Design a protein around this ligand. Structure first.
Ligand code: CA
Ligand code: CA
Ligand code: CA
Ligand code: CA
Ligand code: CA
Ligand code: CA
Length: 701
């Protein structure tokens, strides 16, 4: 048969072979039409039936894909279908499809609800067709000396002026900066002038938005907003003006504010994907203690049966028909991977170490799953708490990873409770302290259905927020702090846990991007941010990168090292200070880790006090220079320096081979953190940078 889906697979940055391009066709522009056949064919034609006449396009094979294209789409409603000739001589015919071309209209088709003096009253254009209103474009005025920071966590640069981007939740495996994508976008930005005054805007939607930040038109920010699948709309844009902090507070009052967290989150976080047994985890905790490099948190990723992510590997039990288990249902074999996980957690707590387990908002369904995982999947479907396709069948994951897995519907309270109740015993009986809520970007399709009533056009970006919220609610209900550790998010994520910068290679450029990611995230209200120090993918980072990264991480909200799965092959890829030292031949790394972890400990009373102030003032912890020094234009030339709370200025050494590093100090007096040497602000200072130094300056109070 012939397959054609006008919107295709709905990958946000890629087209499939069986769709229209653009998906919402526009009169006057080219339209590419694609289709696939299940079997091999010799010919394939596309018939387009306009009101007054017909047209036949003889399609060409592409890479069983077929394609044709119309150079200049006429502004008329039509009908189209495909016809193929199979190799054995059969004529195959598709269903009929509608083609309602849109055009941009300056009529008051809808209303943009917005205040402030930057909105250009005549700029609104509505993309309309006989079928509805699909998107809207409007413009905001920007002045010559203005800088634009926001749109969530960004990996390319601090100031987004001169760039074109969008806000859509997406999984970009590595090189996020190079591709200009992110796991945690937000349709919001603050605009700051060189006199220190600011304004900001928030498009109040969870649908996709695009931004042309004075890239095409030098004095205009062009904003494009998706209006969704059920196409007289009202688009609400919140605005604020005042100091940079007033603008961020305005947004947080609508989005939500960071939650309170326990002190233990500020110690060193240890993690390694290949720690897949109780002995492997404990071997590393024993080495931390033996080397005098204390950890406060251990994250275990490869802890479960790798099928349902609900039960420790090798645990024995009477299987369930998809209902939740309790602590006592499990017997752990002494020769197994986890002989006494309760005992591990108990011993680690006595040593002052908390435990965090990995999760994914997906339920595998494939070929070789055991009866427990298949049952758990069928009970999920049967409960009805699953994201569904338009036809009411369960949504099957369209990504290459976890192919065809189901997605729990975490949009309603009942849905969240059904998924998290399966994990309650981990918190209540085994006593774990939190979860690494990885993923959340798997929902593609504007016509998916959620139990909250929203369709995919709205629910897909909202998904990671609901996901983090679900686990935070579980933890709260079990008497604990809502410590979730996530990578994806959207507006509203501010109120749900902690965040890390995602997956990257062990490179200098990635280190530079990570800094930008943290600062830009802080600027959108993501307070508790961390990253995989020195990168988690590929061969271990060279000694110098590890050293510089470890030092930088020491002066960031969440200090954490992690390593990617590598099939337990040689050589060992853990990002432990000892493994990196072994592999690189640089013994000093262990002393450096000791040195900075000692500094981290001495810094914990400061981090705790500054976090209290951040919650009261609304300011970030990992803080861009403009929050406190916006009346000083020179800050913009040093976008990778940042404040850590009110008192410390941090400037990570991000180049290989540097023996000195230059830092720009704003007005006031500054004190060298390591030597006590006092410098006068308002100029550049050069600091010698042996590996046991990262330029840090404290305001003289
Ligand atoms: Ca108008
Ligand atoms: Ca049972
Ligand atoms: Ca004991
Ligand atoms: Ca992962
Ligand atoms: Ca590499
Ligand atoms: Ca308060």
């Amino acid at each position: 048969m012939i397959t054609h889906r006008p919107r295709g697979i709905e990958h946000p940055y890629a087209r499939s072979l069986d769709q229209l391009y653009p998906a919402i066709p526009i009169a006057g522009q080219s339209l590419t039409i694609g289709a696939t056949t299940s079997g091999p064919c010799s010919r394939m034609r596309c018939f387009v039936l306009w009101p007054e006449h017909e047209q036949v396009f003889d399609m060409s094979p592409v890479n069983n894909g077929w394609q044709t294209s119309i150079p200049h789409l006429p502004d008329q409603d039509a009908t189209y279908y495909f016809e193929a000739l199979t190799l054995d001589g059969r004529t195959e015919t598709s269903e009929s499809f509608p083609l309602t071309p849109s055009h941009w209209s300056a009529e008051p088709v809808g209303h943009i609800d917005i205040d402030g003096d930057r909105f250009i009253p005549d700029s609104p254009l509505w993309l309309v067709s006989s079928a509805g209103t699909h998107r809207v474009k409007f413009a905001l005025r920007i002045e010559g000396d203005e800088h634009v920071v926001g749109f969530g966590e960004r990996y390319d640069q601090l100031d987004q002026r001169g760039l074109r981007l969008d806000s859509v939740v997406f999984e970009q495996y590595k090189a996020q900066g190079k591709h200009h994508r992110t796991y945690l976008p937000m349709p919001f930005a603050q605009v700051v002038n060189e006199a220190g005054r600011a304004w900001g805007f928030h498009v109040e939607t969870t649908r996709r938005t695009w931004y042309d930040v004075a890239a095409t038109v030098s004095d205009r920010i062009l904003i494009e907003v998706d209006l969704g699948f059920e196409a007289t709309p009202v688009v609400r844009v919140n605005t604020w003006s005042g100091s940079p902090t007033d603008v961020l507070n305005g947004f947080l009052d609508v989005a939500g504010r960071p939650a309170e967290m326990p002190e233990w989150i500020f110690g060193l976080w240890a993690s390694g994907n290949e720690w897949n047994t109780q002995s492997l985890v404990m071997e590393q905790m024993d080495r931390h203690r033996n080397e005098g490099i204390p950890v406060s948190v251990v994250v275990i990723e490869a802890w479960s049966d790798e099928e349902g992510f609900t039960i420790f590997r090798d645990a024995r039990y009477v299987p369930n028909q998809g209902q939740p288990h309790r602590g006592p249902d499990f017997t752990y074999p002494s020769d197994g991977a986890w002989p006494d996980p309760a005992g591990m957690i108990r011993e680690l707590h006595e040593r002052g170490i908390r435990v965090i387990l990995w999760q994914i908002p997906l339920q595998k369904t494939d070929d070789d799953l055991g009866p427990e995982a298949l049952a758990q999947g069928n009970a999920l479907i049967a409960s009805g708490h699953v994201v569904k396709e338009p036809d009411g069948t369960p949504y099957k994951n369209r990504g290459w990873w976890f192919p065809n897995a189901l997605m729990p519907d975490l949009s309603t309270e009942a849905g969240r409770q059904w998924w998290t109740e399966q994990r309650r015993y981990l918190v209540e009986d085994l006593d774990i302290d939190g979860f690494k809520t990885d993923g959340g970007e798997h929902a593609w399709g504007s016509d998916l259905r959620y139990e909250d009533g929203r369709r995919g056009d709205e629910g897909n970006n909202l998904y990671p927020v609901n996901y983090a919220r679900a686990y935070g609610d579980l933890l709260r209900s079990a008497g604990k702090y809502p410590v979730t550790f996530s990578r994806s998010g959207f507006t509203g994520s501010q109120a749900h846990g902690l965040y890390w910068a995602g997956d990257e290679d062990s490179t200098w450029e990635a280190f530079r991007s990570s800094i930008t990611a943290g600062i830009t995230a802080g600027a959108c209200g993501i307070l508790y941010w961390g990253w995989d120090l020195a990168g988690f993918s590929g061969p271990v980072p060279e000694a110098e990168l590890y050293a510089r990264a470890f030092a930088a991480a020491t002066f960031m909200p969440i200090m954490q090292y992690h390593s990617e799965f590598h099939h337990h092959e040689l050589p060992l890829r853990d990002r432990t200070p000892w493994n990196v030292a072994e592999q690189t031949g640089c013994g000093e790394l262990i002393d450096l880790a000791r040195h900075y972890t000692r500094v981290r400990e001495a810094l914990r009373p400061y981090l705790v006090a500054q976090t209290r102030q951040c919650l009261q003032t609304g300011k970030p912890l990992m803080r861009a220079m403009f929050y406190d020094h916006a009346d000083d234009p020179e800050i913009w030339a040093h976008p990778r320096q940042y404040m850590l709370g009110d008192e410390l200025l941090i400037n990570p050494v991000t180049a290989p081979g540097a023996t000195t590093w230059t830092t720009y100090l704003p007005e006031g007096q500054w004190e060298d953190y390591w030597s006590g040497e006092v410098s006068e602000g308002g100029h550049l200072v050069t600091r010698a940078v042996g590996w046991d130094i990262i330029p840090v300056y404290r305001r003289v109070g």
